[PDB]
Design a protein around this ligand. Structure first.
Ligand SMILES: *[C@@H]1O[C@H](CO)[C@@H](O[C@@H]2O[C@H](CO)[C@@H](O)[C@H](O)[C@H]2NC(C)=O)[C@H](O)[C@H]1NC(C)=O
Lengths: 50, 50
């Protein structure tokens, strides 16, 4: 914190330098069916731009 | 004030008065953690703050 090898007498409040979280959790809703990419992209016909 | 060259007013009695004077001596002492306020405990943040 002082950026110096030598430290004098003081209360010296110090910034945290330690690691706390080691666990990673993922929460996602229950979805089984795949997205209908085949209908959206692989379609026999497409609409006109207008 | 009624003013005259030969006129003076002298008190024949006195009053003892106690009055209160309030002066602020100190203010709250505060310390700020720079990383906690800006990064909000984010591992990705503070790499930029170095
Ligand atoms: C100066 O003032 C004080 C009061 O401010 C006078 O004392 C009072 O005297 C009267 C009788 O004349 C009493 O009834 C009061 O109760 C007294 N007051 C107190 C607080 O004791 C005093 O007499 C005055 N002196 C002069 C020279 O007139």
């Amino acid at each position: 914190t002082l950026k110096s090898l030598t430290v004098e007498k003081g209360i010296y409040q110090t910034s945290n330098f330690r690691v706390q979280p080691t666990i990673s959790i993922v929460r996602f809703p229950n979805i089984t069916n795949l997205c209908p990419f085949g209908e959206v992209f692989n379609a026999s016909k497409f609409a006109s731009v207008y | 004030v009624a003013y005259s060259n030969n006129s003076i007013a002298i008190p024949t009695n006195f009053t003892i008065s106690v009055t209160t004077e309030i002066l602020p001596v100190s203010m709250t002492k505060t310390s700020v953690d720079c990383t906690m306020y800006i990064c909000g405990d984010s591992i990705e943040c503070s790499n930029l703050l170095l």
